[PDB]
Each structure stands twice: as C-alpha cells, then as structure tokens.
Design a protein around this nucleic acid. Structure first.
Lengths: 211, 119, 122, 115, 53
RNA sequence: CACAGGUGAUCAGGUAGAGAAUACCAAGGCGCUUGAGAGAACUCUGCUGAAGGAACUAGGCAAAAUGGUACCGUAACUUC
RNA sequence: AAUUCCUUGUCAGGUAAGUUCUGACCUGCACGAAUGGCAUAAUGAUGGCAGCGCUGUCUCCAGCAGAGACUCAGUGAAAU
RNA sequence: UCGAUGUCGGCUCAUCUCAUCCUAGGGCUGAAGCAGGUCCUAAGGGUAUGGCUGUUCGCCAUUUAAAGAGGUACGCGAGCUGGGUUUAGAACGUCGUGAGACAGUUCGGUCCCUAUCUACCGUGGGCGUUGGAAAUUUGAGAGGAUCUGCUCCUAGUACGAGAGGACCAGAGUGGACGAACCUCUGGUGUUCGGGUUGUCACGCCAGUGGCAUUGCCCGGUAGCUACGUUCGGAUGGGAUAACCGCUGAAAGCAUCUAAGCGGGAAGCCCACCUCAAGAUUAGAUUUCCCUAAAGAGCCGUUGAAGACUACGACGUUGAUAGGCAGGGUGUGGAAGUGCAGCGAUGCAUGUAGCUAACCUGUACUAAUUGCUCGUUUGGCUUGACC
C-alpha cells in the first residue's frame, strides 16, 4: 500500500486500435528516495518516508539537511509518508529508490492531489444551491442563500449548514483510476482519468483501496 | 477567479486604459524618465518594450505599426531614430523601475520608470 | 438533448408530422433523451386520414438530435433537426418507411427495423 | 508545443499521416465501422467547415446534406476510426470556419473552387 | 440590524487589539550613507549605487 | 447641502439624416472636489450563450423580438 | 353573467391533462329596459383566454465587462 | 404578547419523528408460481414533472422502485415573492329611506432596516503544549458518503390444467445524486485576428486611430465552465432487530432459555473519503541549535494560492516575474510594390502580416547576504540505571 509522489503534467488522450479515445493525465515521476523507515518498535506504526524532486541548499534548512544526510539522499522539494505494513517494508530500506515500476499496466490506483482553488464561493457554486427567480419581482436575492433555519425553535443555525466560504484548494482523492502506461526510464506514468489539481501540482499515486 | 489571466484593470474601461498606457508610453519615450504609480509602471513594460523591440528593425510597415499603436508621429520618429538603434543588441529589459515611496495626495505606491542606457 | 415540451420532426411514414415530447422515460427525474431513448409524445400535426391522429399520446424513439451523439473516439455527430420515430404500445416501430439518416445507436434488437429501413445509418 | 514535454512524448507517438486540407474543400473520409463481427469502411463526403489544429487533438468537422437533412461530423484527425482522407475538390474561402453554411441550402451553399 | 446593548469599553478595546501601525523596513545606502526605505531609492535619487537625476 | 429634481424666452455651425431625432464633430465649454490597489462571495448595470423554447410564473413580469423607404399584397366586420 | 350561493352546475370546443376561457342550456340564491336593456364599427398604457414569432422566464445556470463590496491612505455618519 | 410576537400560498434553504411510501430482513396467508394482503423489525439513503385554480388541497395527464404521514411560530418575508385575505378608487347582485354594509363578487392598489450579541459558514492573529527549531506523523474524535431501475443468464427451468412464470447465484448497462477535471464535445473568451456602417482626426493620397453597447458583424488562444470527460456509493468484518433455531431443565413430557451453543437487516460499530493533539490527557519520530545560534519574520520578484490573510515558489551560489528568443495556437492572405481592369475590384510577391493569458529557453530589467525577533544547555521530587 506504498505509493509514489509525482507531478501532474497535464492531460492528453491515448487512442486504442479499436478507435476509442482514452482521456489520460501524465504524471512526471522523479525517483522517490527513501529518507526514513518507520516501524512498530521505534515509531509505533509502519511507514516509508520518501523525498522527491530537488531543493537548493539555501532553501534546505540545517535540520532538514541533517535528516536527508542521515539517509544519504539528496534533498527533494518535499517529504511524504506512506502507511505501510510488514509486507510493504520488505525490501525498502533507507536510501533506496522507488520508481514508476511500483505500478503495472492495467492496475487500479487512487490519486490524491490538491484541488484547484476557487477561493471564496457562494452557495450556488459551492453546494449546488438553486438560484432564485431572475425576474418576477425578486429584489436582490438571485444568488442568495435563502432560509438558514426555522423559527424560535430551534432558534439557531445548525452545525454543518451549507454556506459560502472557501472552495477548492483541498485534498481530494480520486479512486479507481487505471494505469494506462508506465515508463521508468522516462519517469512517466499515464493514468486514465482526471486527477485533482492543476498541472505542476504534487500528486500522490497509491494502489487502489477498493480493488 | 483569475487563474493565469494577464493584464490589468486599474479601475478603468478597456479603451481608457489603452489610451492611458499609450499616453504613458509616449511620455516615457519623450522624457526617458517618468514618475508613476507602481502597478502602472509594471504594466507599462508590457506595452512599451514591444514597441522598442519592433523599432529594432526600421521599415515602413514597422513604423506604421508603431504609429497605429502610439499615434504620435514625433515619438514614432524618435522610437525608430534613437531608441531602436540604442537598444538594437539588448535582449529586452529596456525599462528599469525604481520604487520611490508613496504619493502625498492618496498614499499610492510610486515608482520611477527609466529607459535603460541614459535617461 | 430532448426534454418535455420539445418539438420533434417525424422520421417515418406513420402520418404524424410533428410531435411534442411530454415525457422522457426511464428514471424518476430523468431530464434528457438522446438518440435511442424512448419518450412519450403527443402528435401535434398529422397528415389527413393517416394511421396516427392529431392529439394522440404514444411512444417514440429519438433517432436524431441537434445536440449530437458522441462516439468512442471523441467525435460528435450532429443533425439539423430533432427527429423521432413512433412506436407501438410495446415500443416497436410502426413504420414501413424511414426518412432521413439515423445513427448506429439504434443497433440492438427493438430498433433493428428502423436501422434496416433508414436510407443511411451513421 | 502548447504542452508539457512529457505530454508531447506521449502525444507524438500516436500521430498518423494524412493529406493536408483547408476549410472549404470537399473531402471523403473513410470511416471504420464494426457491423458486429465485420469491419468495413463507410465514406463520409462533404465540405470541411471548420478545423482545429491541436497536434494529436486536431479535429475537423465535415458537413453534408444526406437525404434532405444536414449532418455534421466532428472527426478527430488522429483517431484510427479515420482510415483515410481524400480531398476531392479544393475550395476558395475567406475565413477559417464556414458556420454560415448551416443556414444555406442549395444554390447559396456552394463554395468557389480553388484552381 | 442594531445592538441590543451598548458595547462595554473592554470589548471595544479587545476588538482594537489588532489595530497596529505599519513600520517600514529601512536600510543605509552604500554610496550616500543615507537611510531609506528598503528596495526604494533615497530621497535624493540613489538606489543600489546608481543615480537617477 | 457646492443636492442626479424644478425653472419662462432668445441664438441655432458641419457631415450624414425628414428632422430642433440620432451619431460623430466646430466655435465655445468641460472631465461633474476623495484617490490608490485588488480583481473573492454577494448586489447593481450590461454583453454572449450548447440543446430545449413559457416546461417559469398569479400572470411571458422581465427580457428577447419587430422596427426604414419604395413597390406588390392585405381577411372577418363596418357607422362606409 | 363585473349579477349564480349551491358551484369546479350541465353539455359542447379547445389541452396529454383546462376551478380560467369560448359556445350553449335555463334550475335568474339574487338580470331586465334612461340608478336604462340588448348589441355595436372605431378607439383604449382597460379585464379574461388562446396562438405565431421570440427568447436566460425556466431545465440549469456558465463565461465575460463596468460600478460597489474587499485592502491601503484621507475624511467620517446612522438607528439602537 | 395590544409603548405591534407581520396573515395564506409559492420560492429558497432546511431539520427532526416513525404511526414506513420504496428499497432491506421476517411470521402468517383464503402463500402453487408471478403478483399480492396483513402484521412484526427497520429512519441508511431515496421519495416526479406538468394542466387547472392565489391556493394549501383536490381532480386530471404522463411517469416512477416509490411519488410516505407528520413536527419544527400550521419551519423559513431583518432570506425573496405578494397572486388570496385585510385600508383608501370603482362597479354588480343583495340589504338599507339614507349615510353605508356583505367569511358575496369584480377591476386596481408603496413589502424598510449598512448585523452589535448568540448561532452558523469560512479564514486569520495570540498564547500554550516543562529549552528552542525544521519537518514528518499516530488518531481520541468529528464530518461526508449510504439510493435505485432495466437487460441478459440460470431458465421458459422450479411451479402450474393452462395463462403465466421464479427464489437463490452470475454478467452487463442506465437514472438520480456527488466529486474532481478540461484531453475530447461545446459555451464564454470587452489588451487575439479579420470584415464592415456613420463621423472626426492624423497635412494630403495611401495607411491608420478616436467615438458610436466591444458601434455592429464573423471567428477565436489561455483561463473559467456543463450540457463535456473520468471516478464514487464498499456485497467485507464485528455485534445485533424481528424472526428461525440446537441441546436443555424448571414442569419424567414438551419447550429457542433459565445454564450453554448457533443463524439473522439498506439499520448499529468498523471498513471508504476528509478533517483531526486547544485530545490543556496539548501525544510520537527524525534531524538541527544554543556568549542573539538553529531558525522565523519584515522586505522584494511573485503563483491555476488568495477578499485581507494564510499557503506555495524564488531573491544574483537566480528562471521568481516582466521582457526577449524560438515554437505552438488563432485569424486568414498585412503594408509596400507590381500586374490585369475605365473602374469598383481581382491576382502575385507570400498562408502573408499580426497574434492575450500557452510551451521551451534565456539574466536584458527587477528580485541589496539588509534589519528585526528568536540565545547562552532548559526548575523540583522520586525511581531504575550509571
């Protein structure tokens, strides 16, 4: 259940011989360098910590530089953890490499990403509220929230009431996407589907939990 | 949202903003140093520098393009007679912006726009 | 995309010339019918002394739309009209002649005579 | 070209060769058809009214009047369903999209030939 | 639409606990030795060892 | 109130235009005494909108639409 | 029925479906002849009903432009 | 409650109950099958669109798995409407001599409030978390989500006189709902490209610009976006409801129960997704640093991040932004010149010219090793080790 961190490069299509277009997105996959192995004895849980990408030394702090030098890996742009188990931690030792061959063609994966940020949005866009009458005497409440509760009883707005607020720029997982192709030498993962975020954003690809 | 969008609004209509930046480009080509608002100074590069790039090569069509976008015949003559030659071998960056504090009347952040290589 | 209160041309010889969608069938809040979808219609203008009379309520299948139909390669195929073919009480065609083209979305079992009678199948 | 270099590497391996054509000309497209268990080609002939040039995402929409009713198909250029394209007659047009031809029928829907 | 009681001076001042004047960053110009706003030219036209007038 | 209101008469340039309508200009006069940014929700005022086309609604409210000149042609009914 | 309570009377027409509308019946709660009766061309920013065209009215909202809202600087209210 | 608690209906947005409408599990049946009926369990989800009428309702049309019954100031007007009712005008019928009146009708008829507090949706600042710091995290807990049709197959089998027609297993494909996304199909695309009307200007021609809604019109990049694309709603685990038991006494029998052992639902608790140590019980791990350090911030260049913030990137040991260069895309054939033509115009030079936000590069301009904050080994007690 360990995965890998990549970069969304954008979407294209893959044509099949039968003449079907498959919408795909391409994930750039620099090698995921193992910076730490966590275990039941020392940490209480089993996980693999990896770094990917690159960071310049002026932007790597002394604490992080010591943490990377302990593993013997070059500092990446970020550090990510993957919940593992005894079978997952089999041959994964500190300083090792995770390449795109962790995934095979045709296999289901889950992709987690940071959604595209819409900023402050009203109920109509954020919660699919119905608009109110464009005409017919409606005064100034075309995109208004409408009623927010009841009368004297309960005399409050309930928690979790759908309202305006920030929308997007959140962690989103799309489940059950298919791996279309894998290229370790090119560092390239082609996945059927949409994959949260904008191109350039960090994405996490993990073997699917539904399967 | 404004994801990836370029350009400015500056509380004007589109035609007013086009006219104002044409005026500002002419004033900068004339005096070589102008004090302006800092957002205006940053947006002025995007309209003034391409004119220098185009005046790098002198032709009737290019002088007419400069005149269509500048509408100043003295400034078109100057742009093709002194500024094109001066910046002939400079890969962009013909303006430099120097921040110079805040305006008295409304506290607007201010900057100086200078033609590089004497101004 | 056909919805209730949409006029469709009639693409067969059943005597109706224009029908109006009064129901999109197959779902409790179903909004649109594309090609191959069964709708309830009223016939709004028919030819004199035809099989079908004006004001009749019956079944139809949409056979071409202006919105278009998508293909697996990503292409869209659009038509200049919205056109249906009238159906029996058992959703079988009551046509002996089909007018205009139809698409290969009618391939199957219950619209095979529509396909075989159409002058051309896209 | 407008894309990430990895998107370009995935896209360039799928380019198919095809003759050049402009909006305005009559073309015949040979379209692969699965009739069930059999593969045949069906010809779609008509006027190219619009193109979009997007590398592997290139598309062109062809219009014909077939048995009275107008049919447009927006073919994807590099889809294998496009078995072949032949340009039958080249047109002389003043624009890239001939959408005005959707409101033209007969004598007023005819494109001048390019010689 | 309006308060049912006047606000106490204590709560009025807790709401002002975030009011604060902005303090500018300053530097010394290498050539003239003069104090200036950081990344801004001096009052007499010097910025990063370069004249403007 | 240095207030988008009200306040009689007179003079009446150009090009289009029937025109004192309208558009753009002349002479003449102004930019309407807070600005600068940003470019969220929401409000107002606009522009465009796939497919459908009154299914909206108390009600086609609002919008959309029509719109000029010449010629042809024009029904019921009528006090002609 | 600008009049009818019962009442969405009945029957016909229009719609897929019509408490409204149109035609008719007469059982007129409770019409009726200058507090005029019944019609009536023309006219009406008059009431009801129905169509064509047209549409963001709606399915179902999207994008965009400007003015606010938001941030900064100056000024600086209100009801309670 | 009359020193004012705004009516009915609609719209928007809800929230709870179960006396359950569908879906789920059951007993009985005048349960052959298919369909039902009745009752028990069950509130997880779901639970139409129109015609008429101000309606709520109701009738009707057409659907649907179903079109639930209710509470919430007959939920919701400091959220919207204002058709009915309930001011002032007017008329009819009726009553009254009359002024007038009518849970009779008819046509018409101003809906205010910039939100202090609680609540709620988002987003920050402070301090704390037994020295400080950069990260990575466990999960006490919280939220989201929970729907369902049809086809095929088993099988025209079981069942049935026929007509008809399965359970239980399996495969597929939809509706409604939700999320992400923009490759495709389209929308928009007022700093992209053209065409064109009127007028004014650039001395004039030519070429261009201003203004007329972006003057109008035809296209259209990026971004945004749905009607487009992809994905999701688990067939699993545990404990159960009704119900069904096994063995078994009290009560020599019988008996699901008293001891003991089973089965069993869309329900419960997990599992999935998101949040989560202010979980003051403030947790863990790895590194770094302590006579101003490790770091953090200010500032600057900024970003598919964003109201301000915050968050992300970068600051010359540099591609952070702009420019520039090369591409791509869009428009569709620039100007000048020449040729044909009386001319409007056509043709060539040449798919030319121009091209926003796109892709890849590149120090040309702007990102100044400046300043501030943040120290100096981190109390005491006990225990094990040493």
């Amino acid at each position: 259940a360990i995965g890998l961190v990549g970069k969304k490069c954008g979407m294209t299509r893959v044509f099949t011989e039968a003449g079907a277009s498959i919408p795909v997105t391409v994930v750039e996959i620099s090698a995921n360098r193992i910076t730490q192995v966590k275990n039941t004895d020392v940490d209480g849980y089993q996980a693999i910590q990896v770094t990917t990408g690159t960071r310049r030394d002026s932007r790597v702090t002394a604490a992080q530089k010591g943490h990377f030098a302990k593993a013997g890996v070059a500092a990446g742009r970020g550090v990510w953890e993957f919940r593992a188990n005894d079978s997952d931690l089999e041959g994964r030792e500190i300083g090792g490499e995770i390449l795109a061959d962790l995934f095979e063609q045709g296999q289901m994966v889950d992709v987690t990403g940071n959604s595209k940020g819409k900023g402050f949005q009203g109920g109509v866009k954020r919660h699919n509220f119905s608009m109110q009458d464009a005409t017919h005497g409606n005064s100034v409440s075309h995109r208004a929230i409408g009623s927010t509760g009841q009368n004297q009883s309960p005399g409050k707005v309930f928690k979790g009431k759908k309202m305006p607020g920030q929308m997007g720029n959140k962690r989103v997982t799309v489940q059950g996407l298919e791996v279309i192709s894998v290229d370790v030498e090119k560092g390239l993962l082609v996945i059927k589907g949409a994959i949260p975020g904008a191109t350039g954003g960090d994405v996490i690809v993990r073997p699917s939990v539904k399967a | 949202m404004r994801h990836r969008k370029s350009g400015v609004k500056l509380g004007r209509t589109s035609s007013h903003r086009k006219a104002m930046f044409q005026n500002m480009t002419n004033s900068l080509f004339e005096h070589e140093l102008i004090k302006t608002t800092l957002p205006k100074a940053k947006e002025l590069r995007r309209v003034a520098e391409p004119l220098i790039t185009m005046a790098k090569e002198d032709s009737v069509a290019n002088r007419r393009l400069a005149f269509s976008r500048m509408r100043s015949k003295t400034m078109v003559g100057k742009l093709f007679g002194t500024l094109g030659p001066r910046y002939q071998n400079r890969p962009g960056g013909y303006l430099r912006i120097v921040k110079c504090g805040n305006r008295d009347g409304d506290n607007a952040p201010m900057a100086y726009v200078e033609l590089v290589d004497r101004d | 995309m056909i919805q209730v209160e949409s006029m469709l041309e009639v693409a067969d010889n059943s005597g109706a010339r224009r029908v109006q969608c009064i129901k999109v069938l197959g779902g409790s809040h179903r909004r649109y019918a594309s090609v191959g979808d069964i709708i309830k219609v009223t016939v709004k203008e028919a030819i004199p002394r035809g099989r079908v009379k004006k004001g009749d309520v019956m079944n139809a299948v949409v056979v071409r739309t202006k919105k278009g139909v998508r293909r697996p390669d990503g292409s869209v195929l659009r038509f200049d009209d919205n056109a249906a073919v009238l159906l029996n009480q058992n959703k079988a065609p009551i046509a002996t002649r089909i007018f205009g083209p139809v698409t290969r979305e009618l391939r199957g079992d219950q619209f095979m005579k529509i396909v075989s009678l159409a002058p051309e199948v896209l | 070209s407008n894309k990430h270099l990895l998107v370009q590497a995935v896209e360039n391996a799928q380019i198919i060769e095809r003759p050049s054509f402009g909006p305005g000309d009559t073309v015949v497209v040979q379209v692969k058809v699965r009739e069930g268990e059999r593969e045949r080609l069906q010809a779609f002939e008509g006027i190219v009214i619009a193109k979009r040039n997007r590398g592997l995402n290139s598309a062109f929409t062809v219009r014909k009047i077939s048995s009275g009713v107008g049919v447009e198909r927006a073919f994807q250029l590099h889809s294998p369903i496009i078995e072949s394209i032949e340009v039958k007659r080249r047109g002389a047009v003043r624009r890239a999209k001939l959408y005005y031809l959707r409101e033209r029928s007969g004598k007023s829907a005819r494109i001048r030939e390019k010689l | 639409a309006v308060q049912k009681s006047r606000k106490s001076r204590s709560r009025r001042d807790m709401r002002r606990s975030h009011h604060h004047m902005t303090v500018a960053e300053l530097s010394v110009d290498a050539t003239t030795g003069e104090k200036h706003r950081r990344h801004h030219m001096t009052k007499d036209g010097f910025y990063r060892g370069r004249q403007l007038f």
